[PDB]
Structure 1
Amino acid sequence: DAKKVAKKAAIQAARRITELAQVLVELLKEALKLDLTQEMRKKLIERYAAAIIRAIGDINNAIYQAKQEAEKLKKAGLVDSDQLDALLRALDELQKVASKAANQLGRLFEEALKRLDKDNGGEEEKDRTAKWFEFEARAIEIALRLAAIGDVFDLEKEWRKLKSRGKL
């Protein structure tokens, strides 16, 4: 089957976003148990930006790697032009929902940095910021997981509509 190309890309996009959420959580918790200077805060900022760049770069790589396997399948005669254009469009929809999740986690970490600066002070608000971020980051990740499963479900139905066309 050629929808394994889309399924693989769907799992990889969800893993990269899940790993990004986990990296941002541990960076916040490391900065919360720590006593921060201006230099430590800037090292944390560089590590947050690297996590975002890594996630975006790895999502981009997986989508382009998925498109190479699809083009491979067209030249191998294992898919026709209409099936390949449905596979490429499903990979484009995965790219967009995965990009939105990365943008939302970067915007989410920004709000977390504002709490580590302003409200921080007292172990109790420390722990509520930690669980606030943990909750909102997982919400972003599961919304991507569900949108990615929906994009494959959309591809499998457009595959059954192309077979239902016959040769008309």
Structure 2
Amino acid sequence: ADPKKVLDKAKDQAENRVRELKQKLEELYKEARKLDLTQEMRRKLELRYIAAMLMAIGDIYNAIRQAKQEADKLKKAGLVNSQQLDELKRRLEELKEEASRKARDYGREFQLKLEYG
């Protein structure tokens, strides 16, 4: 119904997505800290880490894509002008860049903890 509602619904989804990855990586760390983890078990955790990072990137991409499509529909319905359309998409991009940084750093933190416990 307006640019702030589009941007707000996307921010919550990108935060939800980011939170889901944080939680997955926390589960993985707990498994990694179990005693008598064998080499196959370790490798399975490494593969789950990759899949989590990929699913987060894909899910962020989806949330933002959807928001941009919903922004287009506002412009097509005559409910925002050119300024407001571009300003909205700029904001959606910043949101994508911020989410992407947090996901990157969750992965970095996991890797460092996997190396040394």
TM over 0.5: yes
Q: How does 1:1-168 map to 2 (within 5 A)?
A: 1-116=2-117
- Shift, 1:35, TM fit: 2.1
Query: Which stretches of structure 1, 4 residues or more, deviate above 2 A after TM superposition?
Result: none
Size of the aligned set, in residue pairs, is 116
Task: For CA contacts below 8 A with separation 6 or more, give which structure has more relative contact order.
Answer: 2
1:34, distance to aligned residue in structure 2 (A): 4.5
**What amino acid maps onto 2:14 in structure 1?**
A
CA deviation map 1:58-102 (0-9, x unaligned): 001101111000001100111111111110000010010011111
Partners of 2:60 and 2:108 lie apart in 1 by: 18
Q: How far off is 1:32 after superposition?
A: 1.7
Aligned residue for 2:78, secondary structure, equals coil
**Alpha-carbon separation, structure 1, partners of 2:14 and 2:38:** 35
Q: Percent identity?
A: 61
Give the whole-Å Cα distance in 2 for the aligned partners of 1:69 and 1:35.
Answer: 50
1:33 is displaced (CA, Å) by 2.9
Point out where structure 1 has 5 or more consecutive residues left out of the alignment.
117-168
**Following the alignment from structure 1 to structure 2, what is the Cα–Cα distance between the partners of residues 31 and 92?**
35
Cα RMSD of the aligned pairs, angstroms, is: 1.0
Calculate the TM-score normalised by the size of structure 2: 0.95
Q: TM-score, normalised by structure 1?
A: 0.67
Q: Which runs of 5+ in 2 are unaligned?
A: none
Rounded to whole Å, the distance in 2 between the matches of 1:32 and 1:110 is 13
